[PDB]
Design a protein around this nucleic acid. Structure first.
Ligand SMILES: [Zn+2]
Lengths: 202, 127, 180, 214
RNA sequence: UGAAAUUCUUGGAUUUAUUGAAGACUAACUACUGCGAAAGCAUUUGCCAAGGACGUUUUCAUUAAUCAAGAACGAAAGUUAGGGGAUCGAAGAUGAUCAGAUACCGUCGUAGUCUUAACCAUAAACUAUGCCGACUAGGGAUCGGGUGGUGUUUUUAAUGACCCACUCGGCACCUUACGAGAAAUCAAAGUCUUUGGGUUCUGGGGGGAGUAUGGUCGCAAGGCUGAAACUUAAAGGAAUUGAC
């Protein structure tokens, strides 16, 4: 690995944000009247295709082409910017596919202004856990399990999350934010069933 | 020169031993045990007593001229329990602050491939 | 001039560590002034002391103990007490040390410690000011020396088979004696 | 009151030339007398040292060496190889759920007719594209693997010396040979020679010992 | 140990180091995995004989299902004789008798625990669910075998390991209720007042009582079979609510 030290600490903290502290990371490449030095790929992405000038502040040269990562849904083939927590969202915002977003290598050119994905030509698809038995809400079995006490507010006859706009989903995303802030100042969840749903748990 | 010794710590219920030897283990430089530094049986296992014993050993090492020490930590093992108790943890903390250098550290508790019968009968016994 | 300790993380704990990594090194590097790195070649973390900017010999042990508690499975905010306080210890044992029991007898025994919804474990951690984790057959108890013993002697009686109701009564007695 | 440490004398331990650096450390004995000689108390007296010290590289740190004192001269203790072992923490790191543990051992005689016993360990592993969890082997495979390993060990001994064997263990070249031979049977990982224990040894001579020193 | 005493020790206990002997056991890996009629079975290698499933355009041609009498096997403890005798340890001999969480604790130790040759025939020997056959139901996980793939890797083929689809057999799981049930619950505990696929065993309110007596098996301890007089209004199952 690499040693963290009390001198290096601030740089390491920035690296864990995902920002390029080194400069020239993945760089592949009216006169010079303005230039921008920045280490954030999200800003760089906008700058390049608007035909702005980017400055490699580690070296003093303008950048024409760069390679980085973005998300791509393999169902509908649409491309999305990588969120700043650095992992996929659960649902595709276009087609509503569940878990279909994969991180994909991408290149950008000032010259063309276009965006190009790079695909692994020998990809093997994994299909473990795509299909499984799930309860139906209107079965006679379900109506017996529901019980005689009406809606139980503790252990709330749990219903699985399967849609983006299901009201159950709205709670978990905001509650996740709340628990984050509470725990961090005091110190100062998963959806679907995963691949192995079909293997019995003792 | 550092001139390494080796420290053997044996912690159990009821008492703790600190012990230090030449690198070959044949010659013993100092010992002292928890029961030497306290007035009553119920206190022999306490962490407090273990700290005193470790401070005493550290002094005598410097007098002979030992300046660094490897450490081998041990529990009773065998058919008994395997992990060093808090009285052993306390002794290790005290040595680290004594100003001796600590070399490599290793756990040497004896574990059987498979054992003879444990004392206590079929109904179990309060450990 | 240099001294270090290397300690290893077992695989089921690996992912929790990654998710927390940005939380644990700032307290070590700032408050203890140690230096640290995660060595993914061997699934270990390494703590190293620089003699030029460190305060006292106790720093290096505190750091290792803090990380050691985390790999045993204590919560991050429970482990952090080992940086702040000075007299906390860990004790551990496994149920086969108390009584030899094997099949469904073994499963029922650890169920008897947790209790329904964990409520029995939660009770023990309140009547004695301590934290408890159950990692299959092994129990770890974190706390002060005299509190640890009070916890041990009551978890033991559950695995010897006493009914939970009888144990709740004992916890009431111990709690009042601490009040005195 | 004797205060025995006034009576003690220090000596230096010298490792044989097979290892990188040879100043191991010091030991002490009570100062000799005409009544009985100190040298009889020095002979034997095994010493255990981390291999990462002898070679000066930290990647050796999980292996330990035993050295036996055989000769005394000039307040130097001159020593010879006596055994090898793993640290107990490392061994517990390897043993994990959802895989098979394979062991083999054999007893064999060197060309200079030391008699020793040697232990090997290996674990099964997943293929890069596996999807199932637990990577177990069938018992027909385990016998075949165990047979191949025993064949290799019994030909790497009958190397010309006990010393030559030591020169093989340090760079751990034996691990790579087993890797190639089993490649066709099953994918394996963490192949190691775990332990060497010396059972019997020839009648002593000084000639060989001095060749390993100066 | 909750606290302590009996006990061991300046001839050196406990602790450290180098060697040796004996008897028992087979950790981690170890799981909602495997094998066997059941009891039950886990270190390596060799020999001996047996077994299920699968594959089959091989062979015989009803040779089958269940089962009184009768027969083989049957945990632990226990009995008779020889061997062995590390550990633990009914009985026995001893230390303390204080203290309500730790209220049952410490030391030594006979038979036994292991084995050879004969006995015994019990267990919550439990899935508390007799065996054979047909139908009502679907999914993907796993163990063994087989078929297909322009599939991946080992390598330039074959084989091995892995991936995808299909199929026979097995230990389980999730979903489903035409149904069943007093309910808990149930892939059988379904196809039963719309009552009949074949066949073996057992019960008839609670005690007296698994007692007495006869027989039979056993060295013994005991096993198998097994009453009546008399007495009594309940004993029992599942599931609701919640006093001081
Ligand atoms: Zn999409």
């Amino acid at each position: 690995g690499d040693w963290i030290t009390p001198e290096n600490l601030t740089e390491a903290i920035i690296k864990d944000s995902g920002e390029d502290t080194t400069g020239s990371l993945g760089v592949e490449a009216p006169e010079n009247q303005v230039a921008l030095a920045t280490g954030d790929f999200a800003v760089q992405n906008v700058a390049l295709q608007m035909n702005l000038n980017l400055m490699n502040f580690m070296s003093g040269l303008k950048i024409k082409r760069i390679r980085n990562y973005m998300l791509r849904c393999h169902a509908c083939f649409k491309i999305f910017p990588l969120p700043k927590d650095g992992k996929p969202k659960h649902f595709c915002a276009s087609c509503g596919g569940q878990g279909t977003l994969l991180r994909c290598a991408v290149s950008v050119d000032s010259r063309t202004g276009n965006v190009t994905p790079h695909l692994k030509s020998n990809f093997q698809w994994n299909n473990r856990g795509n299909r499984y038995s799930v309860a139906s809400p209107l079965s006679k079995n379900s109506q017996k399990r529901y019980g005689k006490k009406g809606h139980v507010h503790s252990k709330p006859q749990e219903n699985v999350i399967l849609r983006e706009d299901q009201k159950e989903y709205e709670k978990v995303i905001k509650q996740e934010e709340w628990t984050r802030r509470h725990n961090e100042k005091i110190l100062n969840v998963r959806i679907g069933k995963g691949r192995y749903v079909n293997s019995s748990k003792r | 020169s550092q001139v390494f010794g080796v420290a053997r710590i044996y912690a159990s219920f009821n008492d703790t031993f600190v012990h230090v030897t030449d690198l070959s283990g044949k010659e013993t430089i100092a010992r002292v045990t928890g029961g030497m530094k306290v007035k009553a049986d119920r206190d022999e296992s306490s962490p407090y007593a273990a700290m005193l014993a470790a401070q005493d050993v550290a002094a005598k090492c410097k007098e002979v001229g030992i300046t660094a020490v490897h450490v081998k930590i041990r529990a009773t093992g065998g058919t008994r329990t395997k992990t060093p108790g808090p009285g052993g943890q306390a002794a290790l903390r005290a040595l680290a602050r004594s100003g001796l250098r600590i070399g490599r550290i290793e756990d040497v508790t004896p574990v059987p491939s498979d054992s003879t019968r444990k004392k206590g009968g079929r109904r179990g016994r309060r450990l | 001039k240099f001294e270090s300790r290397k300690i290893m993380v077992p695989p089921h704990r690996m992912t929790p560590l990654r998710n927390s990594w940005t939380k644990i090194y700032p307290p070590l590097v700032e408050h203890l002034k140690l230096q640290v790195r995660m060595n993914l070649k061997t699934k270990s973390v390494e703590l190293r002391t620089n003699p030029k900017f460190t305060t006292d010999p106790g720093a290096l042990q505190k750091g290792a103990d803090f990380i050691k508690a985390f790999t045993l499975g204590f919560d991050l905010d429970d482990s952090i007490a080992l940086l702040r306080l000075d007299d906390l210890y860990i004790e551990t044992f496994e149920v086969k040390d108390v009584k030899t029991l094997t099949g469904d007898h073994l499963s029922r025994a650890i169920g008897r410690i947790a209790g329904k919804d964990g409520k029995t474990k939660f009770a023990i951690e309140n009547a004695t000011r301590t934290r408890i984790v159950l990692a299959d057959s092994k129990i770890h108890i974190l706390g002060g020396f005299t509190h640890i013993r009070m916890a041990r002697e009551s978890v033991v009686s559950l695995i010897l088979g006493s009914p939970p109701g009888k144990v709740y009564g004992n916890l009431r007695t111990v709690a009042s004696r601490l009040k005195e | 009151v004797v205060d025995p440490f006034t009576r003690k004398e220090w000596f230096d331990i010298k490792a044989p030339s097979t290892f990188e650096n040879r100043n191991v450390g010091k030991t002490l004995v009570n100062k000799s007398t005409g009544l009985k000689s100190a040298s009889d108390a020095l002979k034997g007296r095994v010493v255990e040292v981390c291999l990462a010290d002898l070679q000066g590289s930290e990647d050796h740190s999980f292996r330990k060496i035993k050295l036996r004192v055989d000769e005394v001269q000039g307040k130097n203790l001159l020593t010879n190889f006596h055994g090898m072992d793993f640290t107990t923490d490392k061994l517990r790191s390897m043993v994990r759920k959802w895989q098979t543990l394979i062991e083999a051992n054999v007893t064999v005689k060197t060309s200079d007719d030391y008699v020793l016993r040697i232990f090997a360990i290996a674990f099964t592993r997943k293929q890069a594209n596996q999807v199932k969890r637990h990577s177990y082997a069938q018992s027909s495979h385990i016998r075949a693997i165990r047979k191949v390993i025993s064949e290799i060990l019994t030909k790497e001994v009958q190397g010309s010396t006990l010393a030559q064997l030591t020169s093989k263990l340090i760079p751990e070249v034996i691990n790579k040979e087993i890797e190639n031979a089993t490649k066709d049977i099953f994918p394996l990982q963490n192949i190691h020679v775990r332990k060497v224990k010396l059972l019997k040894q020839p009648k002593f001579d000084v000639g060989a010992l001095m060749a390993l020193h100066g």
